[PDB]
Amino acid sequence: RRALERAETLRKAAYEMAENQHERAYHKQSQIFQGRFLRKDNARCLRFYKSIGMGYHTPITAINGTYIDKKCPFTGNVSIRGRILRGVVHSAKMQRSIIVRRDYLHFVQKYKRYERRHKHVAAHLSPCFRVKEGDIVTIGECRPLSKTIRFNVIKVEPVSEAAKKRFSPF
Amino acid sequence: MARGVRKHLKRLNAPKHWLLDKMGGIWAPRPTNGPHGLRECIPLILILRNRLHYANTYAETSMILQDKNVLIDGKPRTDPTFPVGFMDVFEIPKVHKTFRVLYDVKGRFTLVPIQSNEAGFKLCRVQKIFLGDKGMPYLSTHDARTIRFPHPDIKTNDTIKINLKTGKIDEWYKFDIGKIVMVTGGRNCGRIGTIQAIDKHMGSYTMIRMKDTEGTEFLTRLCNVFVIGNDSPAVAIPTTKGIRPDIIKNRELRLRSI
Amino acid sequence: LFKKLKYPKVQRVVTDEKYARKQRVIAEKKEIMRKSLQQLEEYKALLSRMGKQHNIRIY
Amino acid sequence: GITHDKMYKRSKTGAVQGKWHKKRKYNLGRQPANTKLIVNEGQKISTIRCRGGNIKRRALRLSHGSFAWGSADISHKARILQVVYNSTSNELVRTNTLVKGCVVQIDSAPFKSALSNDTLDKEILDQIRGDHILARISSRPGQVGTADGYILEGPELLFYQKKLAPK
RNA sequence: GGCUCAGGACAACGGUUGCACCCCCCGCGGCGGUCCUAGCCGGACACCGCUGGCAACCCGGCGCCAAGACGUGCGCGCAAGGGCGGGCGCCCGGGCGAGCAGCGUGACGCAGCGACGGCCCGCCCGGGCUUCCGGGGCAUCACCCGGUCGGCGCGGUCGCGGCGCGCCGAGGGCCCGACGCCUGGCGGAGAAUCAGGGUUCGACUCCGGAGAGCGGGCCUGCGAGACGGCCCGCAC
Ligand SMILES: [Mg+2]
Ligand SMILES: [Mg+2]
Ligand SMILES: [Mg+2]
Ligand SMILES: [Mg+2]
Ligand SMILES: [Mg+2]
Ligand SMILES: [Mg+2]
Ligand SMILES: [Mg+2]
């Protein structure tokens, strides 16, 4: 019975989407062959998802969600490869993108002391994740998605609001 | 930004283990493409001129090679810049000399004279298993040799014994703990040891730990670990069994020889 | 169409050795195909305990 | 001439970057093919010598293509009648220009020649009884020289029907 | 290969990643099934003979002949592209850290090789872009950007990408110094000096980058925005 409820919920999302005439085009998952939704039995899978590997687990929201994102690392058509980094959220104002703040130390040999430095890194945030300012995120490297974006969010660790901004190298 | 591929090689930019003299000349030979690449090979002329001393100039080496007096795995080669590599066969029938190209403890190429019982084959390291046209399985080796329809039991990083006469596999050595290996690159080139641990890091290099027979222990990455048999070596090895002496011991040896 | 003696050398004449060369080439190609077929057959006979995926010859 | 180099763009902060070399042939571009539906006339396709000696062909005019009905597994070669919708601009539709993603009308003769009676998807049978069937383009003309696709069905068919019904 | 350092100040460059977004001549090793006159096919030009223009540079017309040149092509179905083919919380072979490859089947299309057989695949060197860190001075430069920031769709490219176009929303950077201006600014490996800590320089031998009077465009070719290759404007 649990699978049946999922299929009905997914099926509605496809048909209420066709009633949003404001949209210029019909957005779909490339892997799934439209036409399975005309089958009354639940003999076929209606949603596609994958495991990115490296020990990370797929969120239940992506598996049970009703959203389309070709740049998502779980339901889209991109692959994670290279460097995995961490940081805190700096701004979340774009449609599906954020700015990540990274902090590190730089050593000066003449004075035998350090300097605190930071860089800004832009990344893509899939709808499966909810993020506010100050949370800690883990980002994986992918192929160029835009002029400044080469990373994708993979894990979010909430932080309490009102907490003190602190220098947090990661 | 050069408009095309490079064809020259300055003497100072050449690999160190070739041991070219600084003032020999401005230029150095540029090996052509072949079984082995630039950084893991050595041109034929260097062996024929600066090692065996059979020739004193480029022209003599070219004449000798044209006369087809040198065989490399049973096939005469006329290219003065043909690249020679590890676990090759170097036989000169006209002087009844047969050698196998290996690495010395110091990390240089050496010629180990061999017998006829073991001079009709070579050992190859398998680096890749891929599907070719029509889904037919294949395999590739460190010497740029591709074999079709191999045994399923053969996996990556194994060692393969191919007969030179025909070019067919006869047996293979699995990659496992307790198998004698030889290091083919890095700071530990030429050493012989036995695998003791295999530690794999996700998304990065795999590290191999082996112990020398005397008791020494050293580490290297899997990309330059070469199995040369089970427990005991399948092929001949230089006089010293891959034991690198210390500076003090080497200085004592030098003084003794002086 | 139909001192020294100078005449042009004839071209496009098929003497004995051309026939032998063509026959040898044909035989070599035929035996190559036969050996490949035999190797495929023996490999297929092997793998009795595993799957396989090769392009089946049509016709 | 035409280039896709990033050296002529501004930086993420909005600053202007200096030009430190001349134009290179790695980063060149070419004019669009603008493939036109036929509706000295015939199919015309051109060949282009690309980098490495590779060959690329752009269609300038075509009239036919292969279309597949996935649900019943029926594929035939059909004639394209005209473009009726495009998600990028109405000007492409007016000019009858073929690109990937275009929604077109194909002749129903090949598909009504058989299985006009078999109980399949009802929404497609009604189209079969008529003269044209809504379809979509899946290939990239201008790169491969073909215009292939599939017959619509499911939610997308309803979406496009509602889109182009009130007109 | 050789010459030089004009240009260019989040760029070039140095170390460290990646292409599951890529191209690659020679060489080495494999592979080699091709739908519908083969004792061996067809026509030309070059050089050359005759005949000529023009100060030079340059070429014209007629005429028999060769190919490892050009064209056609004997041949056991095969190029590119396109539709369909896995799950029910996650994990526990061709191959991976990673659903990546290959294959079957329904439709299209007949690309390449073949008048002394090589299309194709792998390696190799090389290139293209790309991750992280470093990367001049002036605050009598304090606010700057408007394809500028992001999303959707198509096109083009060897290929990802505001690279370009249409629509949508608004964003992005900054005293941890943005933007602007200046430099008698190519960078590094390194050089001079000398308790230790440091200061100054770095046209020139090795590596990398850029250019061939200034600014643009392009053919050939695997590979050039080539200049001891061609076209245009300007100045000589
Ligand atoms: Mg035929
Ligand atoms: Mg021919
Ligand atoms: Mg200057
Ligand atoms: Mg230089
Ligand atoms: Mg140049
Ligand atoms: Mg030029
Ligand atoms: Mg030149």
B36: CB partners within 8 A, 6+ apart: B83, B84, B85, B86, B142, B143, B144
Q: CA A160: distance to chain centroid?
A: 21
Query: Are A26 and D121 in contact (CB < 8 Å)?
Result: no
Amino acid letter, residue B78: T
For C42, the closest chain B residue by CA position comes to: B149
Structural contact between residues A112 and A142, judged by C-beta atoms closer than 8 angstroms: no
- Tokens read off for A112: 């035998």
**Would an 8 Å CB–CB cutoff place C53 in contact with chain B?**
yes
Residue D40 belongs to some domain of the structure: yes
Residue D125 belongs to some domain of the structure: yes
List residues bridging with C33 in a β-sheet. Answer: none
Nucleotide nearest to D89 (CA to C1'): E166
- Phi–psi pair at B133, nearest 5 degrees: -60, 135
CA distance D160 to D147: 20
**Secondary structure class of C40 (helix, strand, coil):** helix
Amino acid letter, residue B43: P
CA of D16 to C1' of E146 (A): 14
Residue D22 belongs to some domain of the structure: no
- Phi–psi pair at C46, nearest 5 degrees: -65, 170
Q: Which residue is nearest to nucleotide E224 (CA to C1')?
A: B3
CA distance D50 to D25: 11
B152: which chain C residues are within 8 Å (Cβ-Cβ)? 47, 50
Amino acid letter, residue A57: H
A57: CB partners within 8 A, 6+ apart: A51
Say whether the D–C interface has 3 or more Cβ pairs within 8 Å.
no
**DSSP conformation class of A165:** P
Give me ligand 6 centre to Cα C27, in Å: 54
CA of B193 to C1' of E28 (A): 31
Q: CA D3: distance to chain centroid?
A: 25
The dihedral through the CA atoms of A57, A63, A67, A70 has a sign that is positive
CA distance C40 to B225: 33
Determine the Cα angle at B178 with ends B173 and B184, to 5°.
65
CA distance B244 to C7: 76
Residue D158 belongs to some domain of the structure: yes
C47: which chain B residues are within 8 Å (Cβ-Cβ)? 152
A34: which chain D residues are within 8 Å (Cβ-Cβ)? 153-156
Structural contact between residues A15 and A6, judged by C-beta atoms closer than 8 angstroms: no
CA distance A76 to A96: 14
Helix (H) or strand (E) holding C28, with range, is helix C16-45
List residues bridging with B160 in a β-sheet. Answer: B124, B172
D52: CB partners within 8 A, 6+ apart: none
Say yes or no: Cβ of A79 under 7 A from any atom of strand E. Answer: yes
Say yes or no: Cβ of C42 under 7 A from any atom of strand E. Answer: no
Residue D80 belongs to some domain of the structure: yes
The dihedral through the CA atoms of D85, D88, D90, D96 has a sign that is negative
Give me ligand 1 centre to Cα A46, in Å: 46
Structural contact between residues A156 and A114, judged by C-beta atoms closer than 8 angstroms: no
Q: Measuring CA to CA, which residue among B182, B234, B187 is closest to residue B210?
A: B182
The dihedral through the CA atoms of B57, B59, B60, B65 has a sign that is positive
Sheet with D36-37: strands ordered across: D36-37, D55-62, D44-49
Tell me which residue has tokens 């006469």.
B165
- Tokens read off for B225: 């670990």
Label each residue of chain B as H, E or C.
CCCCCCCCCECCCCCHHHCCCCCCCCECCCCCCCCCCCCCCEEHHHHHHHCCCCCCCHHHHHHHHHCCCCEECCEECCCCCCEECCCEEEEEHHHCEEEEEEECCCCCEEEEECCCCCCCEEEEEEEECCECHHHCEEEEECCCCEEECCCCCCCCCCEEEEECCCCCEEEEECCCCCCEEEECCHHHCCCEEEEEEEEECCCCCEEEEEECCCCCEEEEEHHHEEECCCCCCCCCCCCCCCCCCCHHHHHHHHHHHC
Helix (H) or strand (E) holding A115, with range, is strand A113-124
How many angstroms separate the CA of residue A81 from the nearest CA in chain B?
Answer: 8
CA distance C26 to A34: 53
Say yes or no: Cβ of D56 under 7 A from any atom of strand E. Answer: yes
Query: Are B148 and C39 in contact (CB < 8 Å)?
Result: yes
* Polymer length in residues for chain C: 59
Domain count, chain D: 1
For B150, the closest chain C residue by CA position comes to: C43
For C53, the closest chain B residue by CA position comes to: B135
Q: Measuring CA to CA, which residue among D163, D166, D139 is closest to residue D86?
A: D163
B229-247 residues labelled b (16+ CB within 10 A) or e (exposed): beeebbbebbeeebebeee
Q: Measuring CA to CA, which residue among B146, B173, B191, B155 is closest to residue B228?
A: B173
Q: CA B250: distance to chain centroid?
A: 25
Amino acid letter, residue C1: L
Question: Which of D10, D93, D159 is most worth mutating to test chain A (most A CB atoms within 10 A of its CB)?
Answer: D159
CA distance A68 to B88: 57
Pairing of strands B225-227, B192-200: unpaired
A126: CB partners within 8 A, 6+ apart: A62, A69, A71, A72, A73, A74, A75, A76, A96, A152, A153
**By what method was this entry solved?**
cryo-EM
How many angstroms separate the CA of residue B128 from the nearest CA in chain A?
Answer: 20
* Polymer length in residues for chain B: 258
CB-neighbour burial class of residue B175 (10 A; exposed 0-12, middle 13-18, buried 19+)? buried
Residues of the domain holding D98? 30-167
B154: which chain C residues are within 8 Å (Cβ-Cβ)? none
Structural contact between residues B180 and B229, judged by C-beta atoms closer than 8 angstroms: yes
Q: Measuring CA to CA, which residue among B155, B148, B147 is closest to residue B176?
A: B155
Chains in touch with A (≥3 Cβ pairs < 8 A) = B, D
Say yes or no: Cβ of B258 under 7 A from any atom of strand E. Answer: no
Structural contact between residues D124 and D81, judged by C-beta atoms closer than 8 angstroms: no
Structural contact between residues D86 and D92, judged by C-beta atoms closer than 8 angstroms: yes
Strand residue runs (E) in chain C: none
Q: Measuring CA to CA, which residue among A26, A155, A30, B94 is closest to residue D86?
A: A26
**DSSP conformation class of A63:** H
Side-chain-side CA neighbours of A59 within 13 Å: the count stands at: 16
CA of B2 to C1' of E1 (A): 12
- Tokens read off for B230: 């089970």
CA distance B255 to D136: 85
CA distance A7 to A43: 10
List residues bridging with B71 in a β-sheet. Answer: B76, B91
The dihedral through the CA atoms of D87, D88, D90, D96 has a sign that is negative
* Polymer length in residues for chain A: 170
Domain ranges of chain B: 2-117, 122-172, 175-244
List residues bridging with B124 in a β-sheet. Answer: B160
Structural contact between residues B210 and B194, judged by C-beta atoms closer than 8 angstroms: yes
Give me ligand 7 centre to Cα B4, in Å: 13
B184: CB partners within 8 A, 6+ apart: B40, B86, B103, B224, B225, B226
**Secondary structure class of A121 (helix, strand, coil):** strand
Amino acid letter, residue A4: L
Question: Which of D13, D71, D156 is most worth mutating to test chain A (most A CB atoms within 10 A of its CB)?
Answer: D156
**DSSP conformation class of A57:** -
How many angstroms separate the CA of residue D46 from the nearest CA in chain A?
Answer: 30
Q: What is the dihedral of CA B25, B26, B28, B33, to 10 degrees?
A: -160
Structural contact between residues D154 and A28, judged by C-beta atoms closer than 8 angstroms: no
Structural contact between residues B99 and B91, judged by C-beta atoms closer than 8 angstroms: yes
**Would an 8 Å CB–CB cutoff place B149 in contact with chain C?**
yes
**DSSP conformation class of A154:** E
Query: What is the resolution of the experimental data for this entry, in Å?
Result: 3.2
For C49, the closest chain B residue by CA position comes to: B152
DSSP per-residue codes, chain D:
--B--GGGSBPTTSPBPP--S---STTB-------EE----S-EEEEEE-GGG-EEEEEEEE-EEEEEETTTTEEEEEEEEEEEE-SS-HHHHHHTB--TT-EEEEESHHHHTS-SSS---HHHHHHHHSSEEEEEE-S-TTTSS---EEE--THHHHHHHHHHS--
CA distance D155 to A19: 10
